[PDB]
């Protein structure tokens, strides 16, 4: 696999995990993101790395902190971002 060496999974739960599984099957490093209320969710332990995202934010708002996520994406060295479904999956501003 060519120009993606590492990927960020801009989601939680079932869908987050499925992506990680895909990446790992393709030798691609994976990065997870978890809200304060999701320090426990096991999707965060299933990645190669993980960072808290929605700091002080309301729990749903936390996975939509677009800007934060990019900073996290940039600091991680993430070549790409997979938004899964729901949350920022369809959000234009983020896509742009």
């Amino acid at each position: 696999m060519n120009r993606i060496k590492k990927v960020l999974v801009a989601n939680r739960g079932e869908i987050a995990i499925r992506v990680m599984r895909a990446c790992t099957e393709l030798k691609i490093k994976t990065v997870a993101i978890y809200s304060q209320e999701d320090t426990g969710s096991f999707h965060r332990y299933k990645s190669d790395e993980a960072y808290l995202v929605g700091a002080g934010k309301k729990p749903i708002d936390a996975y939509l902190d677009i800007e934060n996520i990019i900073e996290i994406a940039k600091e991680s060295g993430a070549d790409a971002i997979h938004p899964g479904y729901g949350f920022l999956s369809e959000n234009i501003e983020f896509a742009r």
Binding site: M1, N2, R3, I4, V7, R18, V19, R21, A22, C23, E25, L26, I28, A80, H82
Partner: peptide, 9 residues
């Protein structure tokens, strides 16, 4: 999803 990743590459 594997395909999704290939396509993004």
């Amino acid at each position: 999803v594997q395909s999704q990743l290939f396509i993004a590459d």
